[PDB]
Ligand binder design. Structure first.
Ligand SMILES: CC(=O)N[C@H]1[C@H](O[C@H](COP(=O)(O)O)[C@@H](O)[C@@H](O)CO)O[C@H](CO)[C@@H](O)[C@@H]1O
Ligand SMILES: [Ca+2]
Ligand SMILES: [Ca+2]
Lengths: 219, 210
């Protein structure tokens, strides 16, 4: 079986700059009789099916921007993306169409490097309907920030929480290149009713000092 | 156009069988090779199988050979994948693709979940609003994936962030969907999240208000 190894696994390149992604095949994929190197490149945007960009190593599919180009020969291949745009955020895969199994490389996740953007922070208390069921979910939202790195600390009556929260982060936005993050603090209705001040403290490169959003259980 | 539509995926017990279908339109189906490719949620693309134009030449990935069977019905514009002795490592989104220069057209994919866990519908809770304000819906405790969330029947798309689902300590999924709106529209505009958990036949339209 032909193995395709991409390099790097992840890449952060600035808007308007050039991205270089490598694909190395374990053996030659040049079909002499067709005079073609049988390598394909795909873009898979967040939540979408893959999109074929290039086939036969350098032949760009109709409708694909001239900013995408494929090069290389035999065992060493390259995908180049010039004037990187926000909508280029995706995972890129190479695949050989030479001999079955028509194997894929492991993918290269492309991050669009943009200017620092601080998060907008919001806190949500558990709903009355949920509280009736015996559980309280306290949600902290960090909206439209960059870079990804962010510290979310939960405080219940100024006591720092650990091991009782879970985070989820969106993929980089296709338009503004930002991330959004949710942190959910989960407690029993009993533990939730034994306390008053529920706070979410956020640390991020875009904030001069930490931003804390809070609520009083009763109010 | 070209439209490829996969179907047949769902929750199946380990050791069980499933038959996937892929409906094709907008092209001469009998003139192209067809492939199946899978992708474990948040992992890479894994080629699974292909068939030539007539179904006389087929091949499979090492991990599925002897368990899966690709086939096609050229007269009915349909591609198939029979999957037997399913295991946890077969849990993935399964795509069908039309082969040409590369794998040129792909369907939206069909999720196959190999597990002995039960189907469970979610509870939908409001995330009550506090310049701009944030509100949303917490879709808690469901299995298997996926859930979809739209706002005001697909009319409110701007500023909407539907988070990836997280697997909780319980082994059930949870997700939140939020939207940022002007605090001005909190009286004049109604905000409803349309939740669909097709695996459990659960459709919930939840009005979120202060
Ligand atoms: C690898 C490849 O390009 N496959 C394509 C195939 O090409 C055949 C087989 O290629 P190869 O395995 O000999 O390299 C090739 O011989 C072409 O020259 C004939 O079109 O044509 C089919 C359509 O008949 C397409 O569906 C299919 O993607
Ligand atoms: Ca990098
Ligand atoms: Ca593969």
């Amino acid at each position: 079986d032909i193995q395709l190894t991409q390099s790097p696994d992840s890449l952060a390149v600035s808007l308007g700059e050039r991205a270089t992604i490598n694909c190395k095949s374990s053996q030659s994929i040049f079909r002499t009789s067709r005079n073609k190197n049988l390598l394909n490149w795909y873009q898979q945007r967040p939540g979408q099916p893959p999109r074929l960009l290039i086939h036969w190593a350098s032949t760009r599919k109709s409708g694909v921007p001239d900013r995408f180009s494929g090069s290389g020969f035999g065992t060493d291949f390259t995908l180049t993306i010039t004037s990187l745009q926000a909508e280029d955020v995706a995972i890129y895969y190479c695949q050989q169409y030479f001999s079955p199994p028509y194997t894929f490389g492991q993918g290269t996740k492309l991050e669009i490097k943009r200017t620092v953007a601080a998060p907008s922070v919001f806190i949500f208390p558990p709903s009355d309907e949920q509280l009736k069921s015996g559980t309280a979910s306290v949600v902290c939202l960090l909206n439209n920030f960059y870079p990804r790195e962010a510290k979310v600390q939960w405080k219940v009556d100024n006591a720092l929480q650990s091991g009782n929260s879970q985070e989820s982060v969106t993929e980089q936005d296709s338009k503004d290149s930002t991330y959004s993050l949710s942190s959910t603090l989960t407690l029993s209705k009993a533990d939730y009713e034994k306390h008053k001040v529920y706070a979410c403290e956020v640390t991020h490169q875009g904030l001069s000092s930490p931003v804390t959003k809070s609520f009083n259980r009763g109010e | 156009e070209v439209q490829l539509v996969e179907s047949g995926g769902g929750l199946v017990q380990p050791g069980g069988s499933l038959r996937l279908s892929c409906s094709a339109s907008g092209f001469s189906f009998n003139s192209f090779w067809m492939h199946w490719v899978r992708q474990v949620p948040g992992k890479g693309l894994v080629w699974i199988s292909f068939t030539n134009n007539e179904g006389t030449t087929t091949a499979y990935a090492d991990s599925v050979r002897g368990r899966f069977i690709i086939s096609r019905d050229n007269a009915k514009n349909t591609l198939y994948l029979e999957m037997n002795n399913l295991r946890g490592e077969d849990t993935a989104v399964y795509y069908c693709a039309r082969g040409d220069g590369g794998l040129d057209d792909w369907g939206q994919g069909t999720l196959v979940t190999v597990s002995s866990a039960s189907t469970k519908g979610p509870s939908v809770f409001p995330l009550a609003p506090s310049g701009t304000a944030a509100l949303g819906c917490l879709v808690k405790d469901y299995f298997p994936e996926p859930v979809t969330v739209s706002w005001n029947s697909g009319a409110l798309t701007s500023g909407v962030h539907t988070f990836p689902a997280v697997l909780q300590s319980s082994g059930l999924y949870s997700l939140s969907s939020v939207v940022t709106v002007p605090s001005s529209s909190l009286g004049t505009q109604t905000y409803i999240c349309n939740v669909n958990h097709k695996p459990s036949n659960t459709k919930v339209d939840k009005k979120v208000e202060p």
